[PDB]
């Protein structure tokens, strides 16, 4: 299928409390594999996946050197924006970026990302033509115009076609085994008593990976789209994820309902029932 | 490998 290499960058200014906080975090197909945090002592580029340790000591010196440069870059960016928006030098603000690429299974460059956001809102991003930019507000037009002057798009296009695509291939070569791991969910239903003649049936899905999953309750052939309570998938904190869907039902009539768990790691969708 | 970032 498709794969991608993306970087989530953050630069948050803290008034008086010292210089700004800077971070870079890499993801290969949605999995963190590297991280540079300007706070931990000896701010360096650390691998975040055992498979990244096969990188020479030279890979990390260089990435660290580059990160420290990018960092100086964002201290400037922070000050600059304080200017465009006319915001006192006292506040605490945030710049975030998502830079990377997504290439299909045919090796073709599906998508190249270069998005900036200021204080939680879109600021400026590169269009799908990898040729033009989209400004989010009046401020971002200043940036847009500067970047069109300098030919920043040609710079990014060069990166996307060389470095991005090329190292995504390498990271994938070293990560294959680990990245394609798939833990099927273990599911069960719990019985809880609601006020009067009613009960809550809860379907639990545990220890699965990747996070993508779908749980549905069934009242004889139909799906309870309406009255179904269900939590946002959450991490167990050990590599896997959890989730549950619960439905309120008439006491004694619990057998009329069935839970269904659809996961990519399952040979076939699971069918669940409240077991006394 | 992360790209190098210019200025806003």
């Amino acid at each position, epitope marked *: 299928g498709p794969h991608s290499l993306r970087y989530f960058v953050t630069a948050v200014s803290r008034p008086g409390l010292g210089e700004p906080r800077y971070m870079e975090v890499g993801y290969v197909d949605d999995t963190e594999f590297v991280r540079f945090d300007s706070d931990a002592e000896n701010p360096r580029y650390e691998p975040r996946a055992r498979w990244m340790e096969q990188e020479g000591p030279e890979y990390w010196e260089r*990435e660290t050197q580059k990160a420290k440069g990018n960092e100086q870059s964002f201290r400037v960016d922070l000050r600059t924006l304080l200017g465009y928006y006319n915001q006192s030098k006292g506040g605490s603000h945030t710049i975030q970026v998502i830079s990377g690429c997504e290439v299909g299974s045919d090796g073709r460059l599906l998508r190249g990302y270069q998005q900036y956001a200021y204080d939680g809102c879109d600021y400026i991003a590169l269009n799908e033509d990898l040729k033009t930019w989209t400004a989010a507000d009046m401020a971002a037009l200043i940036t847009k115009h500067k970047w069109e002057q300098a030919g920043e798009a040609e710079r990014l296009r060069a990166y996307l076609e060389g470095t991005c695509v090329e190292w995504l291939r390498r990271y994938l070569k070293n990560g294959n085994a680990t990245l394609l791991r798939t833990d099927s969910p273990k599911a069960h239903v719990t019985h809880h008593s609601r006020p009067e003649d009613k009960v809550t049936l809860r379907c639990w899905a545990l220890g699965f990976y990747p996070a993508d999953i779908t749980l549905t309750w069934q009242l004889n052939g139909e799906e309870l789209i309406q009255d179904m309570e269900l939590v946002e998938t959450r991490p167990a904190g050990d590599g896997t994820f959890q989730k549950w869907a619960s439905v309120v039902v008439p006491l004694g009539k619990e057998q009329y309902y069935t839970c269904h768990v659809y996961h990519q790691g399952l040979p076939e969708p699971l069918t669940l029932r409240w077991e006394p | 490998k992360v790209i190098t970032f210019i200025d806003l």
Partner: T-cell receptor
């Protein structure tokens, strides 16, 4: 051409004294400023790349000792002391460390030629 | 030591094809620009190539890139009185601060 303004173009140096070169950045879209030297046998070599004010770095080489400092967002300084032999110095600017100014590659001016005594 | 070209000197009859070699040791180098220096002023870009390509043609110049062997070459096909100058072969890696230059190759095209 004309992103930087480097002076003088040619210069003489009393072998006991040090020299102070200065580079003035014209367009600010290319913050990254560097120093390259071409020695008498024609070998070009990067010396420094500074980005922000307050930055100072000393690097010593066969023929000269160096001290580069980024004084402001437009002024990059280089003082060359103990200059035993001749070398010609070039100042450059770029968008990012691994890119040119508005172009993919670094651009060199006429530089400043330094002939001893 | 990172980049090194050869031969350091070369002469060729006008209308003839001069050929300059170059080689490097950092397999991470992704950009290779060739600069043309005429006695008197700074190095000026002549022709460049990206590691993702293996051939770059512009006018009478041609870069041959062999990513496998870490070797490139410039072909000044149909030389000329003027093409005479010193030719540097440079290289760099993504995120790198410096541009590494080869030791140069002086070329003289005598009519």
């Amino acid at each position: 051409v004309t992103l930087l303004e480097q002076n003088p173009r040619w210069r003489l140096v009393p072998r006991g004294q040090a020299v102070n070169l200065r580079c003035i950045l014209k367009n600010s879209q290319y913050p990254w400023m560097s120093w390259y030297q071409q020695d008498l046998q024609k070998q070009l070599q990067w010396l420094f790349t500074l980005r922000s004010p307050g930055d100072k770095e000393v690097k010593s080489l066969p023929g000269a000792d160096y001290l580069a400092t980024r004084v402001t967002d437009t002024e990059l300084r280089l003082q060359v002391a103990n200059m035993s032999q001749g070398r010609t110095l070039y100042c450059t600017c770029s968008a990012a460390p691994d890119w040119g100014a508005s172009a993919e590659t670094l651009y060199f001016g006429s530089g400043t030629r330094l002939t001893v005594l | 030591q990172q980049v090194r070209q050869s031969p350091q000197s070369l002469t060729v009859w006008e209308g003839e094809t001069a050929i300059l070699n170059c080689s490097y040791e950092d397999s991470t180098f992704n950009y290779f620009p060739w600069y043309q220096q005429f006695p008197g002023e700074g190095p000026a870009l002549l022709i460049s190539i990206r590691s993702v390509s293996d051939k770059k043609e512009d006018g009478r110049f041609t870069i041959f890139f062999n990513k496998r062997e870490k070797k490139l070459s410039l072909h000044i096909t149909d030389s000329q009185p003027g093409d005479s100058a010193t030719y540097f072969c440079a290289a760099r890696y993504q995120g790198g601060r410096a541009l590494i230059f080869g030791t140069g190759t002086t070329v003289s095209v005598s009519p």
